[PDB]
Amino acid sequence: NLYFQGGSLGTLLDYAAGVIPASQIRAAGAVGAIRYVSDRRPGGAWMLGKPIQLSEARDLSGNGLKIVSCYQYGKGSTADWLGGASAGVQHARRGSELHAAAGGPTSAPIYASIDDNPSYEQYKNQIVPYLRSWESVIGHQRTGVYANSKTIDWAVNDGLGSYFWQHNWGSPKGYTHPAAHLHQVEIDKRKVGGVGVDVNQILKPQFGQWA
Numbered sequence: 001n002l003y004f005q006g007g008s009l010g011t012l013l014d015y016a017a018g019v020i021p022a023s024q025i026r027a028a029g030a031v032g033a034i035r036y037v038s039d040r041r042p043g044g045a046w047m048l049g050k051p052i053q054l055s056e057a058r059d060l061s062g063n064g065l066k067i068v069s070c071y072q073y074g075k076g077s078t079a080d081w082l083g084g085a086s087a088g089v090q091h092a093r094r095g096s097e098l099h100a101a102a103g104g105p106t107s108a109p110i111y112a113s114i115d116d117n118p119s120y121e122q123y124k125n126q127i128v129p130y131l132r133s134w135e136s137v138i139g140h141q142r143t144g145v146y147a148n149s150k151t152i153d154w155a156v157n158d159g160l161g162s163y164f165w166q167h168n169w170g171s172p173k174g175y176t177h178p179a180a181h182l183h184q185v186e187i188d189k190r191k192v193g194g195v196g197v198d199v200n201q202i203l204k205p206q207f208g209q210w211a
């Protein structure tokens, strides 16, 4: 149960296991997708949904669906942010390249992923340099952050990131950070076109869509 904060402005799906036709996204009641501009990590060769390719972007856009870019390569003991400043330049450069190669415009942001529930120490020591490096590569105005509500608050206070996508791992129950553009409300509980999807709700009308 979410505290009321205004109601969803539409559903965006995210998925790593495969590519979903536009017609099936629409049929599922979604208005678009948040798609990976990242490679497949070790142990992730199954992730046929990484990265989004140009042919998919054209399908989605032609059907009037919204596209948002996000970036996540590693996870857990291989989380991207562990490497701080150097890792942020490496991942932002790669994300930038894959975004451009998918047809993504320079007017759209890329949501860098903090797929964790970090301590404030980890945040200051590792995540701050990581996100500052993202901003050095693509610019503040293009830097989005996928993170829990505590981490979004920290970033907002430090001036890091222009777009925020909240996850629930370490977020207070029912809470939606008021700076957030997008909220992941359900993970890996449903399939569309045979592909497992997470469900995200749009919180603000300008949320990083390509168009």
Ligand code: NA
Binding pocket: 005, 006, 007, 203
């Ligand atoms: Na709202």
Ligand code: NA
Binding pocket: 006, 007, 008, 009
């Ligand atoms: Na609303």
Ligand code: NA
Binding pocket: 005, 006, 176, 177, 178, 179, 180, 203
């Ligand atoms: Na809100």
